[PDB]
Amino acid sequence: INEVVTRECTIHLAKRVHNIGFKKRAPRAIKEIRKFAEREMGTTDVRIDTRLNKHIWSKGIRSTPFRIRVRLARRRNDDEDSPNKLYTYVTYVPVSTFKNLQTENVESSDD
Amino acid sequence: NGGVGRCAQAKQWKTTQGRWPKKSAEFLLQLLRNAEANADCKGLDADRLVVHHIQVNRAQCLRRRTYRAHGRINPYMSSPCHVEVILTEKEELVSKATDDEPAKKKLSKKKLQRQKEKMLRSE
RNA sequence: GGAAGACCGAAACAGUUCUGACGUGCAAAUCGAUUGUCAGAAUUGAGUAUAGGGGCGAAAGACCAAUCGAACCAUCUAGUA
RNA sequence: GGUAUGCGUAGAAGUGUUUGGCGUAAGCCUGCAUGGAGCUGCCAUUGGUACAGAUCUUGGUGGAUAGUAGCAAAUAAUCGA
RNA sequence: CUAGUCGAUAGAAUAAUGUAGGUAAGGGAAGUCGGCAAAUUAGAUCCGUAACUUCGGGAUAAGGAUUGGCUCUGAAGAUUG
RNA sequence: GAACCCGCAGGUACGGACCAAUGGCACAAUACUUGUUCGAGCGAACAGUGGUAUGACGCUACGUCCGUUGGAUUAUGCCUG
RNA sequence: UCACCUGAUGCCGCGCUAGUUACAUAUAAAAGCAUUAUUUAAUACAAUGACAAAGCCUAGAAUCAAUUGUAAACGACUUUUGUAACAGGCAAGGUGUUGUAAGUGGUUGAGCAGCUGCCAUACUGCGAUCCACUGAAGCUUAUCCUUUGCUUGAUGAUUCGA
């Protein structure tokens, strides 16, 4: 009901991005974050923060690394009172040891 | 009518060709406030308004230019529109109220009496 | 010891076969693969000559301003059929 | 040029027309609606005199499309303010 | 690196055919006008070089071997002898 | 010398399909790898797919599994007359 | 549902018809008199629909959007949505796929150098690769199989009546 919640997600990203060529993978993989967000969130203006670019355009266009750990932060719009009010904030959590690193929500609402 | 090939949603309009014209739906959206901000001068509550009567015509074309094969030139005319809208209230429609013309004389009423008066019609 | 109109090759130029890419183009001739010469008969910016039945032509009637078996522009020209 | 004490801002020329009519027919007469300053009938003459056409000249304008053709070469753009 | 550009309509979408860059087990010109697009060969060192020659060639003929990375010794100089 | 009638086995061409196996093409996922920057150690960082080898989903042929039974009646023999 | 017979309810005996004779009437005539004319129409029949009238019966789908993937140039076509049997994101198992990571350490070595010391003749800081921890490691549904682990989840619009 509060819906300001902040989960610690996980992602398969290459599995999102077969049936596209390379050279658009992967600046497709940040306009297929904007479906990966809202299928778990519903809300709209997914403001992708500039920390996530320096791991996605890190190898270059050819492959995003296949597993990110994004923090979905549905944070309320403080002003600009458009009819939309809940938007999502993403950041970058650079963990590296990916077997059984479970996805969850235990995150204090002011990191 | 085409070639706009298909899209799905237009089955409410029962023929399967449709589009979503971004520039053509900007210019009516402000205009339908430039309509909607005139009855509020007249003090009418705008809920009881519905769209009455709306047409769109053409106007004086431009002439920009294109350059083509073997040296030659053809026009590139984008042709503007006038949008006219009148918004009425939730009114009625009417058919007619009509009357009939008789001209009675000596030998036409009795036949009515031959079928109504002297022969008692059961209802 | 480094000479020759010597060779394979690059910006300089040329333009061959694909008869391939558009043939209402990128274009009133170009792009992309391919191929030839490449230290001289080489390549070239400027100055100056040459004139319409003639200039010029390592010779095809090529070229002379997108025109060339005679231009190009006004007339005798509403020339004749 | 002669002519009808010719109509004309109390609406004259053309423009439309599901008002009405005369010719065999070309063509007029007539009502309404624009319109704003000039016009026709008899009889003498007469000029650059009536158009479906000329691969006709010029100026709008169609269907195709008024949204199709296609805007594809030069590595490729991206989140946040 | 240094300087400077993302400027070529856009987000999307995996149909043909086309547009260009490819590999395809067998045989390998039968294919077709024709071995033409296309494939092998390609650098350098070591040999090894056929007929015809104007005795300058043909000559890179053909016909072959050899070619990393890492660890080492052997050699080619100058000043003060 | 009856490949007679038939039965049996098979085979050609097209025909309809699928993919278990095997052939192809590549999860451009991954291992060895040159050149350059990332200071050195991971990568596949970029050479418009670097080149190489194996390579699962599919899709496919060169592989695979399949493709048949009723009724009139010409040519004709006979039937009775 | 329907016509027929029967169990059997009941009692129309409401209304039948013909032939002869008598009676009580009412009605019936549009001079139109060489009349018809765009030939009514009532009755009755059924068809009706409308209006206030008449009792009864009745308590959903489709359509896109969003999906998914047995379909795909688009549309169409197969499906999906219990406060959660599931959808859906993940992890986890299994299937495979290259072949055996990085990390240390190693008798792992062509040796060359430093100290090779006085004795112990040693440490390596160099070493291409090999060996152990190791069939490791990354890839695995996007158009895989697996859930009792983990979390996410309903609140839309738009059309339609015999």
Swiss-Prot record, chain A:
<dbReference type="Pfam" id="PF01198">
    <property type="entry name" value="Ribosomal_L31e"/>
</dbReference>
<keyword id="KW-0689">Ribosomal protein</keyword>
<comment type="similarity">
    <text>Belongs to the eukaryotic ribosomal protein eL31 family.</text>
</comment>
<dbReference type="GO" id="GO:0002181">
    <property type="term" value="P:cytoplasmic translation"/>
</dbReference>
<dbReference type="InterPro" id="IPR023621">
    <property type="entry name" value="Ribosomal_eL31_dom_sf"/>
</dbReference>
<dbReference type="GO" id="GO:0022626">
    <property type="term" value="C:cytosolic ribosome"/>
</dbReference>
<feature type="modified residue" description="Phosphotyrosine">
    <location>
        <position position="89"/>
    </location>
</feature>
<keyword id="KW-0597">Phosphoprotein</keyword>
<dbReference type="GO" id="GO:0022625">
    <property type="term" value="C:cytosolic large ribosomal subunit"/>
</dbReference>
<protein>
    <recommendedName>
        <fullName>Large ribosomal subunit protein eL31</fullName>
    </recommendedName>
</protein>
<dbReference type="InterPro" id="IPR020052">
    <property type="entry name" value="Ribosomal_eL31_CS"/>
</dbReference>
<dbReference type="GO" id="GO:0003735">
    <property type="term" value="F:structural constituent of ribosome"/>
</dbReference>
<keyword id="KW-0687">Ribonucleoprotein</keyword>
<dbReference type="InterPro" id="IPR000054">
    <property type="entry name" value="Ribosomal_eL31"/>
</dbReference>
UniProtKB/Swiss-Prot annotation, chain B:
<feature type="region of interest" description="Disordered">
    <location>
        <begin position="96"/>
        <end position="123"/>
    </location>
</feature>
<comment type="similarity">
    <text>Belongs to the universal ribosomal protein uL22 family.</text>
</comment>
<feature type="modified residue" description="Phosphoserine">
    <location>
        <position position="95"/>
    </location>
</feature>
<dbReference type="GO" id="GO:0002181">
    <property type="term" value="P:cytoplasmic translation"/>
</dbReference>
<keyword id="KW-0689">Ribosomal protein</keyword>
<dbReference type="GO" id="GO:0003735">
    <property type="term" value="F:structural constituent of ribosome"/>
</dbReference>
<dbReference type="GO" id="GO:0022625">
    <property type="term" value="C:cytosolic large ribosomal subunit"/>
</dbReference>
<keyword id="KW-0597">Phosphoprotein</keyword>
<keyword id="KW-0687">Ribonucleoprotein</keyword>
<feature type="compositionally biased region" description="Basic and acidic residues">
    <location>
        <begin position="114"/>
        <end position="123"/>
    </location>
</feature>
<feature type="modified residue" description="Phosphothreonine">
    <location>
        <position position="98"/>
    </location>
</feature>
<protein>
    <recommendedName>
        <fullName>Large ribosomal subunit protein uL22</fullName>
    </recommendedName>
</protein>
<dbReference type="GO" id="GO:0022626">
    <property type="term" value="C:cytosolic ribosome"/>
</dbReference>
